Amino acid sequence: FSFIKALQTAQQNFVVTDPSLPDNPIVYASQGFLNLTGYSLDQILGRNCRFLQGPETDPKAVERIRKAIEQGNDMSVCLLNYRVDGTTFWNQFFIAALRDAGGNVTNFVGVQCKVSDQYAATVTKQQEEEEEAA
Ligand SMILES: Cc1cc2nc3c(=O)[nH]c(=O)nc-3n(C[C@H](O)[C@H](O)[C@H](O)COP(=O)(O)O)c2cc1C
């Protein structure tokens, strides 16, 4: 709740989605998200965030995000995302399930952090090794 306030003042790139609506659409996007991705609000409001994914996005990573959403818990992962002009960037992605006072999930918050090639090489390597383990 103030978590979201904290992201605003930290000027982060994030969206909030509403899983009560079909296909878990975006109901808010920060200015930082618009700047990073090059989309406008009209393009993304009421839409699922998968438009950030492209042909070279690791599907194992997308799957990890899917399970956390199905279970209503938190995770992070580094994957390839795509801007509106089709240019790419490395995204250290974080997602949190927001629960109400009764413990029911009301929202998801996805924070996008653009990261370097150097950083991404290490983390995706570690992710590949984790996947190879299981
Ligand atoms: C709050 C939120 C933020 C999201 N942000 C991203 C993102 O930055 N990058 C990404 O590749 N997927 C993002 N997604 C994941 C997709 O929306 C989708 O949940 C994922 O691709 C798995 O579900 P699907 O198989 O139905 O596409 C986000 C999802 C949520 C709920």
Residue numbers in the entry: 239 to 372
Article, verbatim:
Aureos typically consist of an N-terminal domain with unknown function, a basic region leucine zipper (bZIP) DNA-binding domain, and a C-terminal light-oxygen-voltage (LOV) sensing domain. LOV domains are a subgroup of the Per-Arnt-Sim (PAS) superfamily that sense blue light using a noncovalently bound flavin cofactor. Photon absorption of the flavin results in formation of a flavin-C4(a)-cysteinyl adduct with a conserved cysteine residue, which initiates a cascade of structural rearrangements within the LOV core that are propagated to the domain boundaries. Here, we present crystal structures of a fully light-adapted LOV dimer as well as of a dark state LOV monomer of PtAu1a.
The dark state structure revealed a LOV monomer that adopts a typical PAS fold consisting of a five-stranded antiparallel β-sheet flanked by several helices. The LOV core forms the chromophore binding pocket and closely resembles the structure of VfAu1 LOV (root-mean-square deviation (r.m.s.d) between 0.42 and 0.58 Å for 101 Cα atoms and molecules A and B PtAu1a and A,B,C,D,E,F for VfAu1a). The LOV core is flanked at the N- and C-termini by prominent α-helical extensions denoted A´α and Jα, respectively. As observed for VfAu1 LOV, the C-terminal Jα helix partially folds back onto the surface of the β-sheet and interacts with the LOV core via hydrogen bonds between the conserved residue Gln365 and the carbonyl and amine group of Cys316 as well as the side chains of Tyr357 and Gln330. A´α forms an amphipathic three-turn helix and interacts with the LOV core through a highly conserved 4 amino acid linker with Ala248, Glu249, Glu250 and Gln251 in the hinge region. In addition to Jα, A´α also folds back across the surface of the β-sheet and covers a large hydrophobic patch. The chromophore binding pocket is mainly formed by hydrophobic residues that stabilize the FMN chromophore together with Gln350, Gln291, Asn319, Asn329, which form hydrogen bonds with the heteroatoms of the isoalloxazine ring. FMN is additionally stabilized by Arg304 and Arg288, which interact with the phosphate group of the ribityl chain. In the dark, A'α covers the hydrophobic dimerization site of the LOV β-sheet that becomes exposed upon illumination and thus enables LOV dimerization. Crystallization of PtAu1aLOV was performed at 20°C. Dark state crystals were grown in sitting-drop geometry with unreconstituted PtAu1aLOV protein (chromophore occupancy ~55%, protein buffer: 20 mM Tris pH 8.0, 100 mM NaCl, 10% (w/v) glycerol) using a protein concentration of 16 mg ml–1 and 40% (v/v) ethylene glycol and 0.1 M sodium acetate pH 4.5 as reservoir solution.
